[PDB]
Design a binder for these strands. Structure first.
Ligand SMILES: [K+]
Ligand SMILES: [K+]
Ligand SMILES: [Mg+2]
Ligand SMILES: [Mg+2]
Ligand SMILES: [Mg+2]
Ligand SMILES: [Mg+2]
Ligand code: NA
Ligand code: NA
Ligand code: NA
Ligand code: NA
Ligand SMILES: [Zn+2]
Lengths: 270, 173, 183, 50, 130, 196
RNA sequence: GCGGAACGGCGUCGGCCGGUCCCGACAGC
RNA sequence: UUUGAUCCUUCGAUGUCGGCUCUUCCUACCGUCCGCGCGCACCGGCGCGGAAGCGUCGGAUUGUUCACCCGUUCAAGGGAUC
RNA sequence: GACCGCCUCUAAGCGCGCACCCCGCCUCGCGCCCCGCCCGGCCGCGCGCCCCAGCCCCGUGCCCCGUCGCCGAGCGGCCCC
């Protein structure tokens, strides 16, 4: 028979499964769309969370009770040491989706990236890019590869890495990220702009501006194995229950003779 | 596929009717067994003579010529699911036996009436000046022309043997 | 007709037309105009300044095509020799409706309908021009060589002006078509 | 409004037929509803402010 | 548009039925579904066939309104429509197919051997001279 | 040798039947330009049918099937699979001999293509019957690559057009050389006695 | 081309019975 | 989704009412969405078609389902071994 | 805008359109791709397009994957790290 009173389900089914993230860090799935003719600019940056604090500001918001007075707001600080560009990658739009054309690496690579290429730097034999750095001593090979990219690509991204030595972290290897280049009038302008800042530092001051809005991607705090009351927010059972009261009383009907994926269960949280 | 038969029949002579009257009918049927069955069917209803009280004197098959085209008018009655109806139809054919086939196929396809549900009242040949239906009339005129009504059939028929071909064939017209 | 249904029309002298695979092109002193009919099975023939349209084996709804196609062709002819002119009337009771033509007669802006706050913009279809009547006071004129485009634009305007959630028998306002013709 | 203007509006907003089955708008001398094919048609009622 | 029409005197090629592969002439029309044909000089007797069997040709013969069997024969023999049809592309192809119609299992082997040589000869020719 | 069929203008079901029979007999077949296959019926009815088909899923876990593909090539492959005993070794090997593509990719651009006229729409449907292409339905139910397929096909078609004239001249030269050559004349004369 | 009724259809094809009509019907004396 | 009529399966046992908790499904639609009609001036009401996304609550008495009353953003009906 | 001289939102054609439907964003993700260390082994031989009430002269061709074919180049694919 029918449930007597109206109530919604508990929790969002669009965030399933609730499992530990298997990606090393937060990754940018999509980049902002590219519009031709706008000034050429970068679209993303990578930093580290530092703290929170107060601010007092003046609110000019026509039509609200706050329009001409002060407000105390919460703010978050993110540490953003400069990034080093070190490679260029181009993609082609295809009936099968986005396919890479080729990636061109700079002549000289810094120690943090090399460290990122191994698991134990002290013992590991140092062979990554050993042949490549001899070929690319002169600019000819780089020019040829960039000509290929100019004649065959639709989307241009650069590869930058962080410098953990400028932070209080214990890590010594760097994080490598791809950053898209948006704007310009053609792919050649994008390729030249990307080539103009290879092996050079990039400051967050040149990416974002004050008053604009951004998205933040990360990995939330961990809690381990957790029960339904805290994992899904279901109601606790009354005090007289035998065998405890932190659970879901009924986990299904007789038919279907299975458990549905829409029922709350215990497992990993955070 | 019909034939046309002339059947003669009579009631067996009795003591008070030494020489009974003879009856002749024209029947269209696929063979002579069916022809005699239909003869007795009509004689029972119209003259109160059953197969058991009578005899068949002769069932003679008659073959027509079949060179030119004539217009035939057929008057019939058939039983539907809601009673009985009369009907006049016009057909164009070379023989009266071939016209009956066309009539029976049209009745089967359009009204859903079978052989034993139909009674043929009269079959006559009509002149080009007294045709009643528009299709026959439009085909009786002189110098009538039209393009091939279904030239795709020739191309389709040949594709059954030649399954895979190096180009799509055209339909000549 | 039982074997084939056909109809014929006359080609005027000032107009010249060409036919090919059911694509009819007409040229006149007002411009050129093209239509496509390859969506129907038709036999179009040109002989001694007459167009004839025939359909073989007219079965069912195939019998309705030759006459409508002939009407479309005659409309093309009358458009090329001299275009169409639809006239609209602005009907209002209390708040006058203010209409302004922008983009060199290629669009119009309507403001203050029923004293509303939002404004309406409609774009004339290719080959359609819009202007306000100099003689008559509250009038709209749209001209063009294709009867389809101008009537479509008039319908667009009329549907754009619509009173919501009232008794439409009593609240009568908007633009209405008052005349269709040539000149 | 001029009376002629009211005549123009009304011919767009008052004069039609209404099907007693589905309530659809039908032309002024139609015998069958364009939607349900039925034949029980009516006349759109006149406003009191004629 | 249309160029070949179902009419009296039109030459017709039979592509299906017991008498497929022969030429005949239309003498009368029964309906949009059947015609009365006759080929006095090609091996076809007078009979009624459905138009689904007859492929229209480009030739037309001038014949009397309702000719008889013997009358039609002289009328056909007095005309060049048949002779000029066989010399066309379609006529030559029909002759070739008639030739193919008579073949056994021994000549199937010989034909295949010659086909193999032709394929090899074509490859050598194309390579040698572009 | 592989049979490569150009599925432009073919009726989906009839082509599937022919291809399944060919696959079970040990032939390898590839289908190209699958977005141009045709389904008879008004676009509304076809779309409603496909939406209804997409509505069936295992209630207690949608990852347990049935799966509903959106690209035209996978739609065609599923239609073919419906006509084959794919749960046995004999039928499982047949489905591994089949390749389906949207457009004409480089892996197949150099083959000789054929058609099956018995399954083509201009011979199978009456003129006034409605029809639609599988590409439009696929786009309406979630396919993402229609515009890219169109762009690539345009580029390839122009490039192919550039290639036709060289073939024209080379073919003319080859024909003249073949006519001149004497050994071929003997073979042609020998074959002419059999009507070939 | 759903199991399916009273009852509707100017969907298409085929009929039966009655009127009016080149002495000009029908739809626009 | 009522209650009857019947006795096909189950007496070497399928734990027999309601509440609490939790999920899913139906539509024969109560509010919200889009159209049309009115004996539709406005406000407010009433009728019809498409539409199942969201909402459909807190209390007093009763084991109660149900019922009944107070209040509020004014408060449709059902299924899943009743 | 016709069948049905008139009238008709429909029969062919065209426009606008719903808290519903589908997609994006968002969560998971088998398999693939690029690059690095390396620069390897194997397999195959075959491209005109467009329309069907112009169908531009048709109603063919292939029919030998060994049945004698197997170099190179080119193009395509697979394997290993
Ligand atoms: K509920
Ligand atoms: K028991
Ligand atoms: Mg207890
Ligand atoms: Mg149990
Ligand atoms: Mg038990
Ligand atoms: Mg409903
Ligand atoms: Na079950
Ligand atoms: Na029950
Ligand atoms: Na129960
Ligand atoms: Na969202
Ligand atoms: Zn109605």
């Amino acid at each position: 028979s029918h449930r007597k009173f109206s109530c919604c389900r508990k929790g969002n089914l669009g965030y399933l499964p609730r499992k530990r993230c298997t990606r090393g860090r937060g990754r940018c799935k999509t980049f902002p769309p590219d519009v031709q003719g706008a000034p050429i600019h970068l679209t993303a940056f990578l930093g580290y969370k530092a703290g929170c604090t107060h601010v007092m500001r003046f609110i000019d918001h026509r039509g609200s009770n706050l329009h001409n007075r002060q407000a105390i707001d919460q703010a978050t600080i993110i540490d953003a040491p400069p990034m080093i560009c070190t490679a260029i990658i181009g993609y082609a739009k295809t009936p099968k989706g986005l396919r890479a054309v080729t990636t061109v690496w700079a002549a000289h690579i810094a120690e943090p990236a090399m460290r990122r290429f191994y698991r134990n730097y002290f013992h590991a034999e140092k062979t990554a890019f050993s042949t490549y750095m001899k070929k690319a001593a002169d600019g000819t090979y780089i020019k040829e590869q960039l000509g290929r990219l100019k004649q065959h690509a639709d989307v241009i991204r650069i590869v930058a890495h962080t410098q953990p030595a400028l932070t209080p972290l214990k890590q010594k290897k760097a994080d490598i990220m791809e950053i898209q280049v948006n704007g310009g009038a053609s792919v050649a302008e994008k390729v030249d702009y990307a080539y103009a800042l290879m092996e050079k530092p990039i400051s967050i001051k040149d990416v974002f501006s004050v008053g604009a809005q951004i998205d933040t991607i990360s990995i939330t705090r961990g809690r381990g194995f957790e029960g339904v009351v805290t994992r899904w927010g279901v109601t606790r059972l009354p005090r007289k229950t035998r065998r405890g009261n932190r659970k879901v009383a009924c986990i299904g009907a007789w038919h279907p003779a299975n458990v549905q994926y829409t029922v709350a269960r215990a497992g990993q949280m955070g | 596929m019909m034939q046309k038969y002339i059947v003669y029949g009579r009631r067996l002579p009795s003591e008070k009717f030494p020489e009974p009257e003879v009856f002749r009918m024209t029947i269209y049927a696929p063979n002579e067994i069916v022809a005699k069955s239909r003869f007795w069917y009509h004689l029972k209803s119209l003259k109160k003579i059953k197969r058991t009280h009578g005899e068949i004197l002769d069932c003679q098959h008659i073959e027509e010529n079949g060179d030119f085209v004539k217009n035939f008018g057929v008057l019939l009655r058939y039983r539907s699911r809601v009673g009985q109806h009369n009907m006049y139809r016009e057909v164009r054919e070379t023989t009266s036996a071939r016209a009956m086939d066309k009539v029976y196929s049209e009745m089967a396809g359009q009204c859903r009436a079978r052989y034993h549900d139909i009674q043929i009242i009269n079959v006559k040949e009509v002149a080009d000046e007294d045709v009643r239906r528009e299709k026959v009339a439009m085909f009786t005129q002189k110098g009538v022309r039209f393009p091939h009504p279904c030239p795709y059939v020739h191309v389709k028929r040949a594709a059954r043997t030649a399954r895979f071909q190096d180009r799509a064939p055209h339909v000549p017209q | 007709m039982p074997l084939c249904s056909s109809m014929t029309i006359k080609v005027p002298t000032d107009v010249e037309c060409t036919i090919n695979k059911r694509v009819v092109t007409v040229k006149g002193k007002k411009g050129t105009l093209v239509r496509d009919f390859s969506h129907a099975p038709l036999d179009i023939t040109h002989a001694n300044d007459t167009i004839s349209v025939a359909v073989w084996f007219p079965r069912g709804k195939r019998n309705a095509l030759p006459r409508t196609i002939c009407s479309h062709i005659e409309n093309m002819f009358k458009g090329v020799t001299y275009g169409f002119e639809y006239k609209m009337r602005l009907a209002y009771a209390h708040f006058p409706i203010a209409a302004t033509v922008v983009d060199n007669n290629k669009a119009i802006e309507i403001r203050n309908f029923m004293h509303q706050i939002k404004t309406r913009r409609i774009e004339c279809l290719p080959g359609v021009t819009i202007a306000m009547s100099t003689n008559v006071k509250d009038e709209l004129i749209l001209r063009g060589i294709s009867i389809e485009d101008v009537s479509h634009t008039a319908a667009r305007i009329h549907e754009s002006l619509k009173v919501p959630n009232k008794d439409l028998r009593k609240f009568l306002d908007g633009c209405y078509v008052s005349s269709r013709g040539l000149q | 409004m001029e009376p002629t203007l009211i005549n123009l509006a009304r011919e767009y907003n008052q004069n039609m037929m209404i099907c007693r089955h589905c309530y659809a708008r039908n032309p002024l001398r139609a015998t069958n509803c364009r939607r349900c094919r039925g034949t029980n048609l009516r006349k759109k009622k006149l406003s009191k402010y004629a | 548009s249309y160029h070949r029409f179902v009419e009296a005197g039109r030459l017709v090629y039979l592509g299906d039925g017991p008498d497929k592969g022969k030429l005949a002439v239309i003498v009368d029309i029964l309906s949009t579904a059947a015609v009365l044909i006759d080929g006095p000089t090609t091996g076809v007797k007078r009979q009624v066939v459905s138009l689904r069997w007859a492929m229209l040709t480009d030739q037309v013969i001038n014949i009397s309104e309702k000719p008889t069997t013997e009358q039609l024969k002289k009328e056909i023999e007095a005309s060049p429509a048949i002779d000029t049809f066989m010399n066309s592309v379609w006529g030559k192809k029909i002759q070739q197919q008639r030739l193919r119609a008579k073949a056994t299992f021994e000549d199937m082997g010989k034909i295949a051997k010659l086909r193999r040589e032709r394929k090899m000869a074509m490859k050598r020719i194309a390579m040698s001279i572009k | 040798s592989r049979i490569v069929i150009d599925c432009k203008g073919h009726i989906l079901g009839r082509l599937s039947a022919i291809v399944a029979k060919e696959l079970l007999h040990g032939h390898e077949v590839a289908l190209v330009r699958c977005e141009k296959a045709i389904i008879s019926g008004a676009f509304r009815d076809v779309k409603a049918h496909y939406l209804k088909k997409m509505h069936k899923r295992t209630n207690f876990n949608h990852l347990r099937g049935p799966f509903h593909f959106r690209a035209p090539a996978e739609i065609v492959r599923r239609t073919i699979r419906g006509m084959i005993p794919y749960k046995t070794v004999r039928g499982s090997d047949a489905m591994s001999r089949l390749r389906v593509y949207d457009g004409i990719p480089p892996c197949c651009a150099r083959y000789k293509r054929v058609v099956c006229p018995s399954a083509m729409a201009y011979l199978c449907l009456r003129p006034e019957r409605r029809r639609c292409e599988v590409g439009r339905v696929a786009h309406e139910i979630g396919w993402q690559h229609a515009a890219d397929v169109e762009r690539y096909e345009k580029r390839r078609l122009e490039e192919c057009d550039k290639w036709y004239q060289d073939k024209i001249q080379i073919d003319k030269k080859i024909a003249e050389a073949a006519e001149k050559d004497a050994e071929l004349q003997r073979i042609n004369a020998e074959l002419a006695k059999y009507g070939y």
